[PDB]
Amino acid sequence: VKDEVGIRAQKLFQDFLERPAASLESPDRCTLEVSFEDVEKYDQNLATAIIEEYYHIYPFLCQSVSNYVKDRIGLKTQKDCYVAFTEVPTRHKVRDLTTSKIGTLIRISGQVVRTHPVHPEIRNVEQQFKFTNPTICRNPVCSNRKRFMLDVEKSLFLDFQKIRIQETQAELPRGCIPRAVEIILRSELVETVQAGDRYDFTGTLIVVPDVSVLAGVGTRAENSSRHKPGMRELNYRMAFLACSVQATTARTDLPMSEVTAEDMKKQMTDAEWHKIYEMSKDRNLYQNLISSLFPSIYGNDEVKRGILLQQFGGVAKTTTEKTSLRGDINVCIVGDPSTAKSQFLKQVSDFSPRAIYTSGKASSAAGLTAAVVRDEESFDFVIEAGALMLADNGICCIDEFDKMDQRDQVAIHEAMEQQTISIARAGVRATLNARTSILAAANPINGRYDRSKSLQQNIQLSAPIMSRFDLFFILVDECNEVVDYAIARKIVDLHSNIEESVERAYTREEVLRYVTFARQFKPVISQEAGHMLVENYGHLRQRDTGTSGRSTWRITVRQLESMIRLSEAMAKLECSNRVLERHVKEAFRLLNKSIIRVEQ
Template identity: 35%
Template sequence: MLVIELEDIYAHESTTSDLVSRIMFNTRRFIQLFCEIVDELMPPPTKDISEYDEVIDVILHQRRQRNDQIVGGQEKFPDHLLRRYNLYFKPLKNDLSLAVREVKGSHLGRLITVRGIVTRVSEVKPLLQVNAYTCDVCGSETFQDISNKTFTPLIDCQNQNECLKNGIRGSLHMQTRACRFSPFQEIKIQEMADQVPVGHIPRTMTIHVHGNLTRLMNPGDVVHLGGIFLPIPYTGFQAIRAGLLTDTYLEVHHVHQLKKQYGDMEVTPDILRKLEQLKRDGNIYSKFAMSIAPEIYGHLDVKKALLLLLVGGVTKVTGDGLKIRGDINICLMGDPGVAKSQLLKFMSKIAPRGVYTTGKGSSGVGLTAAVMRDPVTDEMVLEGGALVLADNGICCIDEFDKMEESDRTAIHEVMEQQTISISKAGISTTLNARTSILAAANPLYGRYNTKVSPVENINLPAALLSRFDLLFLILDKPTREDDERLAQHVTYVHMNNHHPALEFEVVEPLIMRHYIAMARQRRPVVPPEVSNYIVDSYVRLRKVSKEDERNNKSHTYTSARTLLGILRLAQSLARLRFADSVEHGDIDEALRLMECSKESLHDDAEKDFEPDKSVVSQIYRLIKGMGGARGRRKRQKRMGKGPARERDMDVDSDEEEDDETLSMVDIRARVLNAGFTEVQLMETIRQYEDLDIWFLVNNGVKLQFNTIRA
């Protein structure tokens, strides 16, 4: 691999005039010129031929001995065949990276830099550069240089001494053993989200990678690619379909990866000095937590949990192959306007591999993997979705509650097993999705309804909720002091374009990323005394959970997954301190975060289910149950399941009335019979009318449910 850095040529610009700009404007021609110079400078071989050498070396050695194919002092070999190197140009450091949509026809043939995210990577296949033939009559070898996608094979031997002189034709046969192949990979890159104008679809570009640059990129990598922008005509059936159109591609010469995995980042001496200072800082946990989205006011416990999600626990594989995940999953549930989406956006930017997606904008296939037909080989290939692109990173899913149930089930396996099992179009495989899930969801009624239980508000299946290590409920409660501080913070950010001054200097995201990369290399263990403490804590949690279930206060389920969640959070805290073992303090902090995530649920449940409010809630359930039972009876009658006489009597009145309408006479009789008063009934109707759950019609004679909200 021979890399010509344009920076070096630019440093000698006084002697080479405008050579750099000429190279950038006509790169293909200069590759050929540079290769010719390198061929002249290349010294002759210093060792004799052996059976371990390539076929072409043996043929070349034989010809030199026979001296029968040398014409004018030059051997009749294509240049590609004799070169033992690949020549690449590295662009200038100050060369601006273009978005895919900024690449125009004026860039054809020029060396440019394009920025994007890798979406599809093909397998590495051998690309034919020089084809070899053997003559059946004279035994001589003939070589054909191939530069296009298609070629016409040679038929007639070119040996002037025998075959051409005797007029022998059709004696050549292709010999793969003496051909020259180059590793080839086709890659698709897509525009970054910040480069796409509003309302436009992200554009893609085809990338061709040769030689030593193959296998450097994976789906999900954000890359700067320096290469030559070239046209390529369609061939075969594609040409018939395309007509006069021509495709374009980028022939890559340099790959620069921006957001790599945690351990792959380059550390400068300046960054190393700052990291050493942070290691000695005893308050690193709070400092890092407050440095996460400092423009967003409050939510300190949530930010601490998000910091631990970035660090993660230790992933373990047991002797029999059982895998215990170390990645932490968090769900943020809460009212609109509490900055859930902003926290998710910040986390996707600070993580080396962060993918942000929304519930309504994602299908199950878009999250896991899609089966596509490869345009090069015409085979069925898998194209990874958001969870595969976020491998070894974080997948942020906003509007989690708006997802279709069938799409949401695609996440179940990822959250616990960290794999995606695919059986589509004859492809049965398992893809890695070692990612942390950070989800944000709104309650069922848009805002959190304090008059119904938290389980009804959350509206997510228990099987999914148990896979989250932490579930935070963030409510927008009106209190004078908090509202005043929040308003002051927001107005300050709007006026000054940055957050107010904190007690300490905010840690930059780059420094935080490097610190986390070093912390993730630690594998802290749990000592026996701490293990006993965890066991006691888990038994206590199970006991409390059992008592809550007995008192109908339980809103979350404590299981073995809770125990593993505590261990993951504690290991993450130990990693943050660069410790090799977990301490009691780490377990206490993990239990505190667990308690914080449940506290809001319990507090609101206990505060809001006071005697008068619990009565309102009971009456609401009674009326809603009447509506559900009435609707079921009507459906049975329509299907012919009810008694014949009853059907004949009620069919006309049933068809006139709406399924979602109840008579106030029936409601009043049912509620008063249940032991409630008229005042309590009217208060319930008024409160839920304010919430748009139902409304009175026909001058208050009937009550109709709002089907959208109820």
């Protein structure tokens, strides 16, 4: 038998490789992960002797795997197999694809969208797509069309799901688009996923065993005997398949860029005190966090220092059950044209993950829970696809918040205050939990803030827009030769490529590492100075009381909760519980600066 080539493969496999397996034993889930480098450590570089006969001979590796299981566990014929190979070097691309790549073990990734649910599927092997329940006989001569139906009860089965996936974004060519590609996967991988991840799957492409075809007008024929003294056709299409997963890029025991292996509450959740606490409280670090992060960027430099906590966690305290509290906050930017709203807006996308750059002016209302479905695609109703909430505690910042229609209203008032999700179809009445905040991409009418009308009428749009969005922090243009020439003399070396930005002294990487250490305190606030934030807001209120004849505003307690989230996440930035009264002064200061953007 030729497939005793695969017998030798698994002979090879088992002997020298002879605990997660012991973990598998209760439901007999059969899944074990192994490196593919094993083929080089031990199979003596049989990668091309192994890779191609994957679904050829995997049955036989499966057999040997079960036969391994028998070598210590009392094994029975019930046993089945999965295999979960991994650590694939020289990862191939989506274009790495032909007829010729049958049976391979190529590695690929993407995202997870537009998915389908669990609907599962003689001790011989009748499990095929190329299957027939009616068969001829066993011992005697019986008919060739007749059939019994039998023990589907003392037997061995599986379970699976189905999806679609579009092409990756580290790979993005001209012209072409991220087309959709379709897979079923086995059970212990099932429903362990969600939209928005990165992978190194097994891409073992196989074909459709079709039932009928449309526009499949290639050879039309059949394995029909010759002549002497309705039929079927054949035209297929491609798919893919898999065996193994690793969701990547989204990690705190990881010791990151700026580390050495040290001790903590966990392994290296915050182990790097000895190096990072240099940059904990020494407010030169603040100046660095104003300056050593945007060396290529220059405008108003408050935005360079007010935004920063936005990336990082808020409150999430030990609180009531009656209603939700929030940690993170509504955000905006405005200014005028040619004040360079593109410098940072991509590095908004880049500086941290789940940092989704996508435009708003193109959207519909179906950029939240897509729409619905009314054919039996999966169960005639799968309407939990979306566009916004894919962030597992992540940001979805959008561009051009102006020409959009009046639908985002009901999306966003609830989004950053109520965090709920539903549609008006024949789905259900159910709702789920918003993870995300946003910032703006506004712009004025012609851009120019002619100080002759109210800001609300200088934009002239919906009403609560500027009450929910607690911080705007505008960048506005004037005509002063000094300010432009700071910029130009930064261009002096932005293309004189040697040190072609502002002098940096605090890397993005060490900074992004300290980010998570900020999130491991739970500051708890009964501060006397914090209790006097009532006095601060009242003293504020005399100033909200100001600008009330001319240009009264719509002020509320969202701003209050914002103020306290600000000081809270700042104490989280202090690397300290027991919030500091200095936060009172700072909060009051900048936020009573917020009024400067609206004076007329």
